[PDB]
Enzyme design. Structure first.
Site, PDB file in Angstrom:
ATOM      1  N   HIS A 240       0.805  -1.250   0.000  1.00  0.00           N
ATOM      2  CA  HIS A 240       0.000   0.000   0.000  1.00  0.00           C
ATOM      3  C   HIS A 240       0.821   1.274   0.000  1.00  0.00           C
ATOM      4  O   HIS A 240       0.224   2.317  -0.191  1.00  0.00           O
ATOM      5  CB  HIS A 240      -1.028   0.046   1.153  1.00  0.00           C
TER       6      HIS A 240
ATOM      7  N   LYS B  90      -3.852 -10.155  -7.947  1.00  0.00           N
ATOM      8  CA  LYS B  90      -4.656  -9.534  -6.876  1.00  0.00           C
ATOM      9  C   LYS B  90      -5.642  -8.593  -7.557  1.00  0.00           C
ATOM     10  O   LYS B  90      -5.226  -7.708  -8.295  1.00  0.00           O
ATOM     11  CB  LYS B  90      -3.763  -8.772  -5.903  1.00  0.00           C
TER      12      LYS B  90
ATOM     13  N   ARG C  78      -7.447  -1.646 -10.184  1.00  0.00           N
ATOM     14  CA  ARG C  78      -8.502  -2.680 -10.278  1.00  0.00           C
ATOM     15  C   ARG C  78      -8.286  -3.443 -11.575  1.00  0.00           C
ATOM     16  O   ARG C  78      -8.186  -2.832 -12.613  1.00  0.00           O
ATOM     17  CB  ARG C  78      -9.899  -2.066 -10.175  1.00  0.00           C
TER      18      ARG C  78
ATOM     19  N   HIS D 166      -3.425  -2.995   7.848  1.00  0.00           N
ATOM     20  CA  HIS D 166      -4.475  -3.348   6.868  1.00  0.00           C
ATOM     21  C   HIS D 166      -5.032  -2.065   6.326  1.00  0.00           C
ATOM     22  O   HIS D 166      -5.252  -1.112   7.104  1.00  0.00           O
ATOM     23  CB  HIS D 166      -5.580  -4.141   7.587  1.00  0.00           C
ATOM     24  N   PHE D 167      -5.324  -2.063   5.038  1.00  0.00           N
ATOM     25  CA  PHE D 167      -6.026  -0.982   4.365  1.00  0.00           C
ATOM     26  C   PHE D 167      -7.491  -1.381   4.336  1.00  0.00           C
ATOM     27  O   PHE D 167      -7.817  -2.297   3.564  1.00  0.00           O
ATOM     28  CB  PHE D 167      -5.451  -0.769   2.969  1.00  0.00           C
ATOM     29  N   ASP D 168      -8.372  -0.686   5.024  1.00  0.00           N
ATOM     30  CA  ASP D 168      -9.814  -1.044   5.150  1.00  0.00           C
ATOM     31  C   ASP D 168     -10.588  -0.453   3.983  1.00  0.00           C
ATOM     32  O   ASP D 168     -11.412  -1.167   3.402  1.00  0.00           O
ATOM     33  CB  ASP D 168     -10.434  -0.665   6.484  1.00  0.00           C
TER      34      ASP D 168
HETATM   35 RH   LIG Z   1      -5.370  -7.326   5.688  1.00  0.00          RH
HETATM   36 RH   LIG Z   2      -3.866  -9.120   5.436  1.00  0.00          RH
END
Ligand SMILES: [Rh+3]
Ligand SMILES: [Rh+3]
Length: 124
Positions: free
Chosen positions: A12, A41, A85, A119-121
């Site tokens: 990220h 991904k 994406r 983590h990127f939420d």
């Molecule tokens: Rh995660």
């Molecule tokens: Rh993870």
């Protein structure tokens, strides 16, 4: 193994530039961060602020995470980001992405000592 903090930075963080100026940015970055190794991904966001500014989000607006944990934090400011994406016709191993630039708040889960994003939420 890779620490959770380090996985967050690999997936990220791209402090490097202020903007994803190339339409191929995602194709090259998703490769260079090892996110096309075994499968493409499908969705990934890169953040184009300093590491210090992203880590500082962990002292900003506390919000619930998508998973219902309460260690998520929303950036008070908007941040320069790139949304990657996968295209509708993308086929491993020739993974193909649309690059979109945006200026949005990020939501990250924070954990550990030091207390940093793991983590990127979401972006909002
Ligand atoms: Rh995660
Ligand atoms: Rh993870």
């Amino acid at each position: 193994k890779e620490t959770a903090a380090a996985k967050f930075e690999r997936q990220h963080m791209d402090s490097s530039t202020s903007a994803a100026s190339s339409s191929n940015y995602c194709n090259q970055m998703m490769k260079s961060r090892n996110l096309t190794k075994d499968r493409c991904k499908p969705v990934n966001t890169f953040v184009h602020e300093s590491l210090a500014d992203v880590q500082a989000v962990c002292s900003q607006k506390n919000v619930a995470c998508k998973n219902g944990q309460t260690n998520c934090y929303q950036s008070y400011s908007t941040m320069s980001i790139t949304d990657c994406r996968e295209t509708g016709s993308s086929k491993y191993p020739n993974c193909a992405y649309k690059t979109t630039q945006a200026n949005k708040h990020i939501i990250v889960a924070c954990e550990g000592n030091p207390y940093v994003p793991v983590h990127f939420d979401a972006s909002v």
